[PDB]
Structure formats: structure tokens, C-alpha cells
Amino acid sequence: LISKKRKLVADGVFYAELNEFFTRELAEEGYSGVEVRVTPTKTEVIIRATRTQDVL
Amino acid sequence: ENVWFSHPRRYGKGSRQCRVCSSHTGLIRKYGLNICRQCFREKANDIGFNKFR
Amino acid sequence: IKIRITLTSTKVKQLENVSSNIVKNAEQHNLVKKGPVRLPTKVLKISTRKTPNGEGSKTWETYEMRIHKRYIDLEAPVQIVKRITQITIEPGVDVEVVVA
Amino acid sequence: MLMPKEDRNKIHQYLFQEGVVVAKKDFNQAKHEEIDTKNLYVIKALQSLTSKGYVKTQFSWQYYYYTLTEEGVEYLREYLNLPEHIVPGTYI
Amino acid sequence: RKKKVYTTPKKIKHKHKKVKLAVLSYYKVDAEGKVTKLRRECSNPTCGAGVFLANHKDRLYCGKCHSVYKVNA
RNA sequence: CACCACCAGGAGUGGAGCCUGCGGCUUAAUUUGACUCAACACGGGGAAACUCACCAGGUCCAGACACAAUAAGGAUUGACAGAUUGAGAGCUCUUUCUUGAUUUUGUGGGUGGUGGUGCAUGGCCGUUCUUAGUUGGUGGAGUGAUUUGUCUGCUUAAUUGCGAUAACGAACGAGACCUUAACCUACUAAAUAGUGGUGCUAGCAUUUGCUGGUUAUCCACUUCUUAGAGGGACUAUCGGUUUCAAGCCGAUGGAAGUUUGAGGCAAUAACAGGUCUGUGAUGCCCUUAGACGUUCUGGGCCGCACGCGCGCUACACUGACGGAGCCAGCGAGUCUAACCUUGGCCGAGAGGUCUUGGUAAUCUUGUGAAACUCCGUCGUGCUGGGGAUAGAGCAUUGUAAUUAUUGCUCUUCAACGAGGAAUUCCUAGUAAGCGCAAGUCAUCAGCUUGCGUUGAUUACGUCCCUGCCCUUUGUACACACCG
Ligand SMILES: [Mg+2]
Ligand SMILES: [Mg+2]
Ligand SMILES: [Mg+2]
Ligand SMILES: [Mg+2]
Ligand SMILES: [Mg+2]
Ligand SMILES: [Mg+2]
Ligand SMILES: [Mg+2]
Ligand SMILES: [Mg+2]
Ligand SMILES: [Mg+2]
Ligand SMILES: [Mg+2]
Ligand SMILES: [Mg+2]
Ligand SMILES: [Mg+2]
Ligand SMILES: [Mg+2]
Ligand SMILES: [Mg+2]
Ligand SMILES: [Mg+2]
Ligand SMILES: [Mg+2]
Ligand SMILES: [Mg+2]
Ligand SMILES: [Mg+2]
Ligand SMILES: [Mg+2]
Ligand SMILES: [Zn+2]
Ligand SMILES: [Zn+2]
């Protein structure tokens, strides 16, 4: 029960925070960005790196 | 002793800080994001704020 | 039954074909519907100084964020209501259903 | 740091169970979440664990992310006297 | 900066770290009898007659519960 | 070339009183950065505490880890009362319980610092300059460095282009682009937008009307409101003038004919420009337990003989006061919290209290804003102009308001009669007047960022002043005349 102004700005800062975490520690696998996908029953976060074998 | 960290911090510049760099000055509290003015300007593009005009 | 789909993204071109695919998939199932009401777009503006220090010429800077919000009202038995919302979910577009 | 033996066993047993621990850099917050002990205890004790190669940290907007190592699963096991391969992070 | 004279009156009184005392747990000792207890304990809801009581001038402590238990004779 | 220059002007500032920033003086401290443009309502810097860095004092370790020492016949921790202390800090002591290997004492070795150095740096920003500037390919000139292209002229906001022409053809910047504002009885649609009807009613007339109210009256509608997709302007057409070319100037049509208006973005080469006090961005230097760490209590940043710079209120009937009319746009708003507040009641007020609506085109909110308009009292009087500076009370925020936080009442009712030398900004919905929202915000706006309302005069030029650019020229300069 939060307004749409705050809700969309919250997901912006959520993306911004989660991008900084991925770029700080996953540097040595070639992290080149992140995508977040809200969905019924689940949120999905697609990490984009180069050494994908290393992130697994 | 209990006297440590006992002064109230419920209002005023001492209650809030930048969620990125924990600074007190130049905070941006509009729309509830609470990032300092120099850190928001570095993060505005990936939050979703853009320059048009 | 009176269910209502509301879209509130910021990407207009993602939002529209989401909204178009709701209304077109409605019409194969031949449902009567209030076609999309487009509420006034609201601009979130943040005006900050450019400089990190307080030197130079006093140049300001306005970052803005546009939020587009549409609602479609539907009346349908349960099986279409389960089908329509389960598909056509596009990333960055927020969908929520209310009944009555 | 001088903290009672029971909550260091709380911190150490919670770490084993979750493989991870997240901790806001707020001293004097005085009440951690996911753990009923002081926030200063879980930061400082995990500062003592990282300085012996058992856990590694990342700051990432004042949150202190801890994930324990291969050294971590052997040391802690010796510490809790639990059965072999009883670490959740290690086994899918 | 200008200077540091360290002006203030000298009050360096860093404390005693509770000086190691001599042999303790002096309950009483009884020649061929059962020993009673000096330093009365406490009728608490937790303390199971293991914690003694300080004998001050006109008050009895607790130590682990820091609460006076003195009652009139 | 250019209202960060002048012209013809408009509104001022400089005079006054206050508000605020800087220097100075003073101080325990009055923390500090920034001194032409390009410091001085700037650090979003509206500081009661916190912020906070400064000053007077008091705690704590939040000194990792390693190795030694100490040491379960206790390594160490905590405290009741009293002295003490600003203190219900046992902080320290008297006093004696409690805890249990976590600590303690050193050696290293770390850690933290709004400590220093922006002249050691990164990133960002400002400035040159938002002017119009910059560069290759191929050809030509030259032994070469280099040069032409990139120009005598005309033109443009513009190296924008026409023209000349040993140069042709491009690139970056300008322009295009993107956002926004203006047009759409053309499309797609809508009680969270709005009409018209038909029900149900109210009042007034009475003929066959006028104005309202109503949410389950329902049926249709999209003109107005909103945003999706599109259309539309391209200086179109005509006239005039110019190597008759790029253009410019009138008229007609048009929603629109200054780049349609306004921005966003913005080249090469720079600058010892600012920022280490935004950063868990940082090298080195310093500090690191009577700390330059962190916290708590109290002060300070506000102190006032003076000199400056942004402002607010005014000096008055083109007005002050009273009553009545009465109209915007940009926007913000709470849940696991207490924000925006309608309505009823109490109170002169500021305010209090009981309910309600709102996570929002739904409710505050037609944000009933102010200037303004109409009727009245004043009647050239430092005056009913002005409301500084003082005295009493009543409230509100807050742990706290004394060097009055702010609001309200009554009283006191100062300078100031349009401001010297100097100097700033500006070409149409623009200047100027007038308010409102947002930011900071527990409280506090004389500030800033925006938005509407009311709306002029003057010009459609030039190099006179001040800056900047270019050409020619001289040079013994080249860290480049501070040579
Ligand atoms: Mg400055
Ligand atoms: Mg003046
Ligand atoms: Mg300042
Ligand atoms: Mg200042
Ligand atoms: Mg200090
Ligand atoms: Mg430090
Ligand atoms: Mg400090
Ligand atoms: Mg530098
Ligand atoms: Mg050549
Ligand atoms: Mg040659
Ligand atoms: Mg050539
Ligand atoms: Mg003519
Ligand atoms: Mg008056
Ligand atoms: Mg308003
Ligand atoms: Mg007086
Ligand atoms: Mg002059
Ligand atoms: Mg004005
Ligand atoms: Mg000569
Ligand atoms: Mg020379
Ligand atoms: Zn920050
Ligand atoms: Zn006890």
C-alpha cells in the first residue's frame, strides 16, 4: 500500500543498489549489467557476465 | 554505560543520511529516496531520471 | 464480475503493446470492456545544482521521470481472468488486477 | 571484543546455517535482525573471522556481505562439533 | 592548528582491574559437622542458592542481581 | 561581433530601515573553503541539541590478527548505597559480592580521522565559449618546417551559405536531433474528465419558460479535459530590391512566418580555476587510548566601533484602511506509518478537540492566491505614509526556546520627502508589478527552483565605450611583456 510515485522510484533505487553490488564483487567475471523482472509468484534477476561458467 | 548514544535522533539533520555514502549534507528526500545530492547525480540515469529540457 | 487491469510503467512503448494485447485478446473472447483510460502523465522532477562543491556559475539541472498510468475494466468468467493476466507481462511494466 | 560466549555461538551457528550473513553498518542499532543479538557483535565477530581467512566481506552501500570459505566450513565444523558435510551453503 | 598545551588538570586515574583476591568460597568450615553458610543468599525465581550476599554496613547485596535484600532483624 | 557592450528607453541598485553573505574587530571558541569577470542568499551552508569540523569538560574501545606474558587454589567483566560528578557515568574511590578464558599487559601489526596537501591525483563542475571554431583524403606551392583548401566581397544566429577561385570532395562543432509550449468540431476512447437529455425534486414565473440540487435515474455523446497514433510550416503565395544568387523587406493567407517560442545536448586545444568537508574515490605526511577515533553535557558558528556585496519593506491619493465582488497554473501528501487535511463544535486571534476522505485525474482542491474590480472613510499633514526599535500577555513545534524559534493581541510608532560619484539587467506574453507550489523542513523564508496572473515604453541600429575574435605588420620574445 504505497503510492505509484514512491513505488517506481523505489524500484529505481533497488536496481541502482543491486547494480552496485554486482559490479563491486562480480568484477572478475566481466559483469556488464543486470535486469530485474517483476512477475506473479517470483522476481527474476538476469545477470549478464562474460565468464558465465565462473559465476555458476 | 547506557548514557552512550542516548541523545535523541528522531528529527533533524542527525536522523537522516545518504543511503549510499552515509553523509548528512545535501540530502534529497523527495519521493523518499534519501540519497545525497552528489550521489543522486551519479545515480540518476540508472534510477530512471533523465534530462530532457 | 468487474475485474480491472491497471498499467503503471514509465516505458510508453512497452506499456502500449501490453495494453493492446490485453484489448485484442479480449476481442477473440468477445468481452465488453471500457477501452483504456489514459490518466494525465505525471512528471517527477528533481532540480539539483551541477557542481559537487559550491563554486562556479550557479548552474542548476532538472532530472525528470515520466510515469504513465492506464486502466482497462473487464467483465469475464474466471477462466479468461486466469488466462489474460498469466500471459503478456512485460519487464518494467507493472500490472495489477482488482475485482469489482 | 568482549562478548559473552552464548551469542558468539549464536553468530557462529547462524553463519553455518545460512552460509551467509548480512549486517547493516549501524553501530548502536543494538538489535540485529535474523539474530536476537546486538548488531555491533555480529559485525565485530565477523571482522574477527575475516581476519583469519574464514569469511570474506563486501561493503556495497553499508551492508557488509559475508560468505564463508572452504576454510570456513572446516573451521566452523571443528567449532560446533557437528557431523561432516553439514553445511547448507556447500551442498545444493 | 595553533598548539596543543594539554592544559587541563591531571586526573589520570585509570582504574584497578578488580585485583585478584586470595582463596575464596568461604562458606563456613565445620570440624566433623555439616557446614552452614555465611553471607546469606536469595529467595529469587532464578538464582538457585548459589549466589551469596555482600555484607556491607547495614545492607546486603546480591552481586548477580545487584539488588539489596536486607530485612530488619 | 555581443543589452554578461553601447544606442532609444524601461525597471532598478548605490541614499534609508531591516534580512542575509564576506572582510575586519572581539573571543574560550566566534570551525572552515572560495577573492575580477570566473569569491561574497555560494558549499543546495534557512547551524537552539544533532549535523559540527571549533571551544570547556566528562565516558568508551567499537586497539582485527599473530606471538609472548598472565592465569581455573581465577586471565577479566558488571554493580546496590555513600563521597565524588552537570549527572540515576561506580567514571574514580570506600565496601564487598558476581562473572568465567570471551578478555588483560607488551611486541609487532592494524584500524578510524569533516586532520594536511586540489601544487601529488581520479571523477565531477566552472571558464576560455556556447562565441564559431577545428581537422583529414586526393591534388597544387615549397629542400624543409609548413601552406592552400579554411578567401577580396555579399550574406547569416552561425567557416550559415552564395560567390570569386589551385583546388575538389568530405568530417567534428553550428544546424539536424530530443524534450516542451502552441493547432486539430480528423481517428482511437473514458462516472478517477465533462456536457446534453430523461427520471426525482427545489425556487420563481406562468405559455410552450428561467436557474439550481440529485448518485446507482438510466440512454446516447467527445465540443471543451486527458495521451496514444498521426497530420500540419516549408518563411507557402505575390510584390520589391540585390554577382538578379545566397538572402532581405512589405502584403495576403494561416493556429503558427523573430532559428515558430523556450530549453537539453554541445568540437580541438587548454586553466597548476574549484572541490581531499559528498563518496567504503584516493597517493603520501600526520594522528591513533590523558586520540586529531566515537559518544555525552554546556557553549560557539548569531558575538559589534566599522568597510563591502546579493535582497525585503518603503518614501504615498496611479495611494492607505473598511466592506462587497471574485478568477489560475506548476505541483506534494500516511501503514505498519501518523503526512495532506474536508466537515461539525469551542475560542477575538493564533490555536484546541470529535469524526471523515485520500497510497491519489477519485480526497485536501474550483488549492475561492495576491495584484485587481465596485462602493465607502481619509484629504498633502512624516499624515490613517512607513512599521524599525522597545514592554506586557496567549498559543504552537520540540528533551530543551534565555542572546526574544515561530505564530497572535494590545501598546510604543524611528529613519526615510525618490537618493552623489558610480553601476546592473533587459527587445515581447518580453521588462516590470503580483502571488502560489516545491526544495531545504520536528519548528522557522525577507533565499532558490518553477508556475500562473496583470502587462508597458523603446529599438529593429552601430563600433562610440567595454570586452572577445580575425587580418596585415614588426620582433633580439617562445616557462612566450609578469618576456
Ligand atoms: Mg564559490
Ligand atoms: Mg540600500
Ligand atoms: Mg555559507
Ligand atoms: Mg558560510
Ligand atoms: Mg571533535
Ligand atoms: Mg579516524
Ligand atoms: Mg571527528
Ligand atoms: Mg588537482
Ligand atoms: Mg599535400
Ligand atoms: Mg612536394
Ligand atoms: Mg593537403
Ligand atoms: Mg520592399
Ligand atoms: Mg499603516
Ligand atoms: Mg495554491
Ligand atoms: Mg520604543
Ligand atoms: Mg556609465
Ligand atoms: Mg516580482
Ligand atoms: Mg622596427
Ligand atoms: Mg627564442
Ligand atoms: Zn551520498
Ligand atoms: Zn541473584
Curated annotation (Swiss-Prot), chain A:
S-S bridge residues: none
Statement: the UniProt record of this protein carries the keyword NAD: no
Subcellular location: Cytoplasm
Family in the record: Belongs to the universal ribosomal protein uS3 family.
Free-text function comment from the UniProt entry: Component of the ribosome, a large ribonucleoprotein complex responsible for the synthesis of proteins in the cell. The small ribosomal subunit (SSU) binds messenger RNAs (mRNAs) and translates the encoded message by selecting cognate aminoacyl-transfer RNA (tRNA) molecules. The large subunit (LSU) contains the ribosomal catalytic site termed the peptidyl transferase center (PTC), which catalyzes the formation of peptide bonds, thereby polymerizing the amino acids delivered by tRNAs into a polypeptide chain.
The keyword Ribosomal protein is assigned to this record: yes
Protein name, per record: Small ribosomal subunit protein uS3
Any one GO CC term of the record: cytoplasm
Full protein stretch here: 4 to 59 of 240
Keyword terms, alphabetized: Cytoplasm, Isopeptide bond, Methylation, Phosphoprotein, Ribonucleoprotein, Ribosomal protein, RNA-binding, Ubl conjugation
GO biological process: cytoplasmic translation; maintenance of translational fidelity; nonfunctional rRNA decay; ribosomal small subunit export from nucleus; ribosomal subunit export from nucleus
Other notes: Present with 146000 molecules/cell in log phase SD medium.
Sites bearing Phosphothreonine, chain numbering: 41
GO-annotated molecular function: DNA-(apurinic or apyrimidinic site) endonuclease activity; RNA binding; structural constituent of ribosome
UniProtKB/Swiss-Prot annotation, chain B:
Phosphoserine: modified positions: 22
InterPro entries per the UniProt record, alphabetical: Ribosomal_uS14, Ribosomal_uS14_CS, RIbosomal_uS14_euk_arc, Ribosomal_uS14_sf
GO MF term set: structural constituent of ribosome; zinc ion binding
Cofactor descriptive note: Binds 1 zinc ion per subunit.
Compartments reported by the entry: Cytoplasm
Pfam families reported for this sequence: Ribosomal_S14
Keywords of the record: Cytoplasm, Metal-binding, Phosphoprotein, Ribonucleoprotein, Ribosomal protein, Zinc
UniProt-listed GO biological process terms: cytoplasmic translation
GO cellular component labels: cytosol; cytosolic small ribosomal subunit
Gene3D superfamilies: 30s Ribosomal Protein S14, Chain N
Amino-acid positions noted as binding Zn(2+) in the UniProt annotation, renumbered to this chain: 18, 21, 36, 39
Cofactor annotation: Zn(2+)
Top-level lineage group: Eukaryota
Remaining remarks: Present with 6490 molecules/cell in log phase SD medium.
Description of how the protein assembles with itself and partners: Component of the small ribosomal subunit (SSU). Mature yeast ribosomes consist of a small (40S) and a large (60S) subunit. The 40S small subunit contains 1 molecule of ribosomal RNA (18S rRNA) and 33 different proteins (encoded by 57 genes). The large 60S subunit contains 3 rRNA molecules (25S, 5.8S and 5S rRNA) and 46 different proteins (encoded by 81 genes).
Similarity comment: Belongs to the universal ribosomal protein uS14 family.
Identification of the protein by name: Small ribosomal subunit protein uS14A
Source organism of the structure: Saccharomyces cerevisiae (strain ATCC 204508 / S288c) (Baker's yeast)
Gene behind this protein: RPS29A
Curated annotation (Swiss-Prot), chain D:
Places the protein is found: Cytoplasm
GO biological processes: cellular response to amino acid starvation; cytoplasmic translation; positive regulation of protein kinase activity; ribosomal subunit export from nucleus
A Pfam family matched in the record: S10_plectin
Cellular-component GO terms for this entry: cytosol; cytosolic small ribosomal subunit
Domain of life: Eukaryota
Family assignment from sequence similarity: Belongs to the eukaryotic ribosomal protein eS10 family.
Cited SUPFAM superfamilies: Winged helix' DNA-binding domain (SSF46785)
The protein's role, per its UniProt record: Component of the ribosome, a large ribonucleoprotein complex responsible for the synthesis of proteins in the cell. The small ribosomal subunit (SSU) binds messenger RNAs (mRNAs) and translates the encoded message by selecting cognate aminoacyl-transfer RNA (tRNA) molecules. The large subunit (LSU) contains the ribosomal catalytic site termed the peptidyl transferase center (PTC), which catalyzes the formation of peptide bonds, thereby polymerizing the amino acids delivered by tRNAs into a polypeptide chain.
The entry's keywords: Cytoplasm, Ribonucleoprotein, Ribosomal protein
GO molecular-function terms, A-Z: RNA binding; structural constituent of ribosome
Coiled coil: none
Lineage: Eukaryota, Fungi, Dikarya, Ascomycota, Saccharomycotina
PANTHER family in the record: 40S RIBOSOMAL PROTEIN S10, RIBOSOMAL PROTEIN S10
The keyword DNA damage belongs to this UniProt entry's keyword annotation: no
PTM field: The N-terminus is not modified.
Protein name: Small ribosomal subunit protein eS10A
Misc remark: Present with 54100 molecules/cell in log phase SD medium. There are 2 genes for eS10 in yeast.
Keyword Ribonucleoprotein: yes
Curated annotation (Swiss-Prot), chain E:
Chain positions found as Phosphoserine: 43
Cellular localization per UniProt: Cytoplasm
Zinc finger (C4-type): 42-65
Residue(s) of cross-link: Glycyl lysine isopeptide (Lys-Gly) (interchain with G-Cter in ubiquitin): 28, 34
Superkingdom of origin organism: Eukaryota
Subunit and interaction comment: Component of the small ribosomal subunit (SSU). Mature yeast ribosomes consist of a small (40S) and a large (60S) subunit. The 40S small subunit contains 1 molecule of ribosomal RNA (18S rRNA) and 33 different proteins (encoded by 57 genes). The large 60S subunit contains 3 rRNA molecules (25S, 5.8S and 5S rRNA) and 46 different proteins (encoded by 81 genes).
Biological function: Component of the ribosome, a large ribonucleoprotein complex responsible for the synthesis of proteins in the cell. The small ribosomal subunit (SSU) binds messenger RNAs (mRNAs) and translates the encoded message by selecting cognate aminoacyl-transfer RNA (tRNA) molecules. The large subunit (LSU) contains the ribosomal catalytic site termed the peptidyl transferase center (PTC), which catalyzes the formation of peptide bonds, thereby polymerizing the amino acids delivered by tRNAs into a polypeptide chain.
Protein name from the UniProt record: Small ribosomal subunit protein eS31
Species assigned in the record: Saccharomyces cerevisiae (strain ATCC 204508 / S288c) (Baker's yeast)
Lineage of the organism: Eukaryota, Fungi, Dikarya, Ascomycota, Saccharomycotina
